[PDB]
Amino acid sequence: IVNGEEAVPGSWPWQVSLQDKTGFHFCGGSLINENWVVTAAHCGVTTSDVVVAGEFDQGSSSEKIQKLKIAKVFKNSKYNSLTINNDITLLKLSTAASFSQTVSAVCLPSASDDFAAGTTCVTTGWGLTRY
Amino acid sequence: TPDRLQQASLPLLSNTNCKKYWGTKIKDAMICAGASGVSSCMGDSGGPLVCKKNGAWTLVGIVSWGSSTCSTSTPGVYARVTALVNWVQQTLAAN
């Protein structure tokens, strides 16, 4: 995020980090329950990647984070890689996340929910802060 | 990329209004947000775009794509969860 700010640690409990076996963060995701993570289809997640929950500072060695293995990748069959439409993939954890103060689920809306133009929302992540 | 988790508030736009920036690349399963002095960027992909609805944070978008330069004056494009939630519900039910 360019021009964002540091979050209050643990305040966005559903935020997870997708890391490859190298330990490199390549994408974010959101826990919707203890066994499923929603992420973007273009992230190209494989079962060799790891879901990291309860993390704030990727440089700290003393945070009690949960490194969860992925059992299966569910790429929306309607995802069009040429237009990046329907960019969503579900990840089923081989090991269920343990919910706590710093790890929990975000809510999903109803297909008929309305989010009006002008509404202020929040986006989170560990992406580049300057390009 | 930053070691610590970042956050930013940003407004949602309408698709008709977003097409002014991205033209026809804006499809129905997409929702635009930003162009407010902030911007999602590389490494943010897949993360959440949440809005408070009746007291709880709900998943409105998934960080998808945007300007190759993360321009804070161009809107970012997110997958619209309201158009994809029926598939999510079907997938969780079958597995």
Binding site: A7, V8, P9, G10, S11, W12, P13, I32, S100, Q101, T102, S104, A105, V106, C107, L108, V122 | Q7, S9, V50, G55, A56, W57, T58
Partner: peptide, 10 residues
């Protein structure tokens, strides 16, 4: 869901 134990501050 959606109600964090540690309140976010913006």
């Amino acid at each position: 869901c959606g109600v964090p134990a540690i309140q976010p501050v913006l």
